[PDB]
């Protein structure tokens, strides 16, 4: 099944933050309504934040996270979790190699902000 795609409420600000746990440089693309709205690139084996930004979900609310290393898309896992019917987390893990730790880039999307 498709992973890394989330429908947010329309016209809503959200945070997106990416962490890296891999020898490879991670490239994280964040699309809103099928167009790139943010791109993070970095390398860390220690969960360093390689990027954090505030975006707007726009008229469609469609947000997609893509992760690649050296042109090779990583295998994504994702889910959305809502706490007290209000606080939303859209979560992505990714595997760029052979060990299936799925942490090579970790992406956290959170809303509402403010």
């Amino acid at each position: 099944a498709t992973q890394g795609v989330f429908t947010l409420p329309a016209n809503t600000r959200f945070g997106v933050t990416a962490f890296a746990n891999s020898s490879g440089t991670q490239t994280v693309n964040v699309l809103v309504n099928n167009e790139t709205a943010a791109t993070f690139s970095g390398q860390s084996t220690n969960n360093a934040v390689i990027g954090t930004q505030v975006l707007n979900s726009g008229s469609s609310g469609k947000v997609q996270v893509q992760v690649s290393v050296n042109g090779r898309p990583s295998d994504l896992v994702s889910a959305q979790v809502i706490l007290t019917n209000e606080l939303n987390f859209a979560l992505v893990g990714s595997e760029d190699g052979t060990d299936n730790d799925y942490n090579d880039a970790v992406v956290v999307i959170n809303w509402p902000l403010g």
Binding site: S23, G24, N70, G97, T98
Partner: peptide, 6 residues
């Protein structure tokens, strides 16, 4: 790690 072995 990017390497033939990996």
């Amino acid at each position: 790690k990017a390497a033939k072995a990996c």
